[PDB]
Amino acid sequence: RLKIVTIHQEPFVYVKPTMSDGTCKEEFTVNGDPVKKVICTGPTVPQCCYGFCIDLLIKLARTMNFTYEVHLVADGKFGTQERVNKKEWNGMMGELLSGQADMIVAPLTINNERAQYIEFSKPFKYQGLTILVKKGTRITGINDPRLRNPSDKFIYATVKQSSVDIYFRRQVELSTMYRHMEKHNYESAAEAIQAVRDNKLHAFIWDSAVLEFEASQKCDLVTTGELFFRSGFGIGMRKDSPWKQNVSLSILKSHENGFMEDLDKTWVR
């Protein structure tokens, strides 16, 4: 019985209240296809979980025949490595290596950092990083003056303890932007996004699979379009888990099957 952790991140994981009798509200798509929902415990009430990853967890659970319990990550973070001297990981990463999760199913970005300590499946989604701005605000993209030059008249940030924070911190040439950002990063993408709608935040640097989806729904927002960096989401597992190879075999299969395609038409596009 695998313990799967995950994290609220539309459109990959919607997290929605339970009905009275502890069941999830039955739902279909406007294309007439059933909306699978699994119970997920978290910050500690059980709730209802669905979305792109969730269907993907169900295909994996069926393909490789296991059972599972899902929960939301304790600290609500993706995970970076921090000092205590020893070092430790926060968010989904720390839970994966502590044994609190047997597998991460989420938009977990694959990077050399994480991959040193955990195994990733072959990517299940190909995406990148982009910038989300409130429509009306018009910057040219990653090299816009008001961005390469930092100043508290135009505030831009990413998400605390994420692959984007790692990315902006590992690279000596991103030092100025990163010095601006760490004074402004948000604990979660919903917060950060809700700020851009409240004018409190001006540019969000986040995953295009998520930011592009927020522009197509919340039409007060929009992104740049330019992808200044490209990255992939993988399933995370502990070093040498029995599952790693069959998991990624199942990801390749689902790409060629068009299964991932149908997830994109259901959740992302």
Binding site: K122, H255, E256, N257, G258, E261
Partner: protein, 279 residues
């Protein structure tokens, strides 16, 4: 041991092959690469010919040789292309690996389920997939476009095709049976062959490896041939290094590749070899 037999396969811009400088030395961003060249078509005898090899993946192979610290004897594959299981005996680059004639294959080799059951693939180092090239102005979502799955639902019916006997043809044959049947009469010789049929209005669309269609579109004179957005690419995947099942090198190769995408060294190679003049 850290001296390694590596197989590759010519396919500009990922691997580009040149004769040796006449001198017999491979100068510049070229690396030596031998090729066993047959004497005639009715004997197994041949000579090992010396050539020089450059390109996007050759630059990859260089960085890995420096980062992961190995040396290598690169050769090109004589029997087959990327690797096809023919009566359960692989040819291509995959076959040189499975039958332990190379310990890794470097090239424009796509990562698929079938190959992964017999070789190990490193993390992908360039995104590819199945994509659609059209002349600018044709409106097409992607492979799963209705104008492709039910072609006679539109008048005139679209004229599209691919180059048969590859992965694009096979993938389509399995996923869209009636699309496969219809586009058969529109099979192409090869990529340069199908571009011209696009540009002279003979063909309406070309369905093929997405990295290769992007690279073509980048360097198309007049910038009139275009591919669909990256978000409409089907069976997204990527090029990777094939190693042997259980290879002890896969770990250092994966870390090395993810480092090169992380610190910018990969985007630089992309801009060096892959980015063209259109858009």
């Amino acid at each position: 041991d850290n001296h390694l037999s590596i197989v590759t396969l010519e396919e500009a811009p990922f691997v580009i092959v040149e004769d040796i400088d006449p001198t017999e030395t491979c100068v510049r961003n070229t690396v030596p690469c031998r090729k066993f060249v047959k004497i005639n078509n009715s004997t197994n005898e041949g000579m090992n010919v010396k050539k020089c090899c450059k390109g996007f993946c050759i630059d990859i192979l260089k960085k890995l040789s420096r980062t992961v610290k190995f040396t290598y004897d690169l050769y090109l594959v004589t029997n087959g292309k990327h690797g096809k299981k023919v009566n359960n005996v692989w040819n291509g680059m995959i076959g040189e690996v499975v039958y332990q004639r190379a310990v890794m294959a470097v090239g424009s080799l796509t990562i698929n389920e079938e190959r992964s059951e017999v070789v190990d693939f490193s993390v992908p180092f360039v995104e590819t997939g199945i994509s659609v090239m059209v002349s600018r102005g044709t409106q097409v979502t992607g492979l799963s476009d209705k104008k492709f799955q039910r072609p006679h639902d539109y008048s005139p019916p679209f004229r599209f095709g691919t180059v048969p006997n590859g992965s694009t043809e096979r993938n389509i044959r399995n996923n869209y049976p009636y699309m496969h049947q219809y586009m058969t009469r529109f099979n192409q010789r090869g990529v340069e062959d199908a571009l011209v049929s696009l540009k002279t209005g003979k063909l309406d669309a070309f369905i093929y490896d997405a990295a290769v269609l992007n690279y073509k579109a980048g360097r198309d004179e007049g910038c009139k041939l275009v591919t669909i957005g990256s978000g409409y690419i089907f069976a997204t995947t990527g090029y990777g290094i094939a190693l042997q099942k259980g290879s002890p090198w896969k770990r250092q190769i994966d870390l090395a590749l993810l480092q090169f995408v992380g610190d910018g060294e990969m985007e630089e190679l992309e801009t060096l070899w892959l980015t063209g003049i259109c858009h």
